[PDB]
Amino acid sequence: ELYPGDIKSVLLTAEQIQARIAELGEQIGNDYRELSATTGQDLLLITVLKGAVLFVTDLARAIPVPTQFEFMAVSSYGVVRILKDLDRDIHGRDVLIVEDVVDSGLTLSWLSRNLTSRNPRSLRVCTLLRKPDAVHANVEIAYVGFDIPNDFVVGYGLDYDERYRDLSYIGTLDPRV
Amino acid sequence: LYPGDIKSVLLTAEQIQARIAELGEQIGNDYRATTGQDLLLITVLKGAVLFVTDLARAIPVPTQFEFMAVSSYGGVVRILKDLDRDIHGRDVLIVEDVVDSGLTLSWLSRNLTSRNPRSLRVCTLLRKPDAVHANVEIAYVGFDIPNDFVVGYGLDYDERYRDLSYIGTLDPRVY
């Protein structure tokens, strides 16, 4: 065990995650199958740094169609500041936003509006985890991995002060941390 | 995924994960309470994002993530995205996908050491024969491969073939 005592409870084991991603990729693959030959360009996965890097690497390999990578680095104004923009113009591209968790959905709403103004051919959202407050915002999420309670969790990219990211499983963090 | 593009398979997906399992265990034993700070993996976007996610899960000690985005001018690169936190007194492990000319690695090494980390080592999945010409000490190497252009497992040709679980050799007709 990496963090003894810090993990209060195990929410999603590594077995659950990889199995869900396996069938998530198949679903995404089935939907974007008539686009690798109907258009001419591969599915574009856009990921916000950095908690969703573990998920996007497993997902891209789980999707049975060719996929490309694009990353974004953002920070909150203390509406978010762009620390690192995309490398390519996503005009006429099939873009799939890949998130790790959607709670308030504020940044997701911003990102959705920001990418759509770049005029993609298509634009959908895929997240590994969805929290109850994501009902209050509504950005249409076509691909949801898991619906979980409103408890702070870590593991599989998810963090608390840049820690617990390297966990293969997703568990609930102990409040004493 | 890419019918007719891949000529042959250099490293299968099973062999990659098996070696990464070895690397993590090796890295884990070397970096294993005194500091009170976790191991810090610094990765240059974006061909080594697949390798660092598997490696970090293969390392039996707590590891953190830091990413950098760079671009070429025109040995010297442009920082498009710097680190999020100060690596002062931190055990930094640079994670690369492949080292060939090693000019960017040389630049990155000098750049990070000026930030004064506690330690600084380099781990790469692949190493090409002309890495000897680059004066950068690499503590952890996954595979020594020929100079032939390869794709897969993060490696790309015009932003493609990154999603391949294996590392294959591209057909020169494509390149």
Next chain:
Amino acid sequence: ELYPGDIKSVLLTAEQIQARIAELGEQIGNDYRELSATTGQDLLLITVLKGAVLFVTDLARAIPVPTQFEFMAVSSYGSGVVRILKDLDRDIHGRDVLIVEDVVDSGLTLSWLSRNLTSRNPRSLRVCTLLRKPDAVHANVEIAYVGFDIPNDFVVGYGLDYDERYRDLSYIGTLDPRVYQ
């Protein structure tokens, strides 16, 4: 001289520039003097690197109301389609913002910048350019403050450049074709 054999003719002398900016300053000052003390926040000047840098410095010192500085570094993906190299430092939400440009011709980047800043929901958004080319006279992006209506000549000076040169010129002149060939 600084660039002999390069500058063919002076389109706008140094004197004509300082005289027009002073006039622009008071005009902007009067229009924003109300909202200045009413909202309690200063006028926000947003400038895109790096041509309009010289212009925004002289302009802000010409406006008789307190003005703040803000910069944004951008790049082109391909030919408007714009990549952000350096985003703004603070929130634009609920701020009186005046876009400060050096010159507008195609207006592609300006159209992008306008649409982008409006998404941040400013209290007010207007554009001020030092120079305007014929193809930008009847654009969709409204510009309330135009310094000069210059012809379609490729000009350098006062921030303007060709291959990162002639920026330091105190005046604006028509560059010789022998240079940009």
Next chain:
Amino acid sequence: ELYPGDIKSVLLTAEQIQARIAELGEQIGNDYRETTGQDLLLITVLKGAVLFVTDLARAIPVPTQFEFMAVSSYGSGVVRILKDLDRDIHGRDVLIVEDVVDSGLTLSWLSRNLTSRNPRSLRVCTLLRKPDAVHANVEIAYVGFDIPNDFVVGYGLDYDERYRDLSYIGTLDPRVYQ
């Protein structure tokens, strides 16, 4: 008056500021007039020294170019790069243009960072210098003024992103930065 009751006193008027910059410009020009074919490269860190660099470049008789860097802070010369140079300064004559040097920790980093890019020549020009920078480890060949340790604003200098547009440099009243 832009700010009626905020400026305690005027340290440097607009007249004596532009007079010094004119002197600096000629001094820089006569030094860099001496063959390479490449112009003098001015490097400025946002945002304070953006007013000084525009006036200085127009005060320097030799052709000068513009390069800008934007930096932030981690904790702290520990520093983050938000906007790197968009040009390679290899074998270039680089002059760092600063607004004020106090602790000089940022300047120390900027020196080490730029020198690793291997410029032809690297020098520093600052408009203002505070007592704890007079005998700093980084050499500054061009100093406009040596001012006291008092917190000043104006001519690019700021407090909470204000007072930058002032044509003069004045001392802020303790009421403001309390």
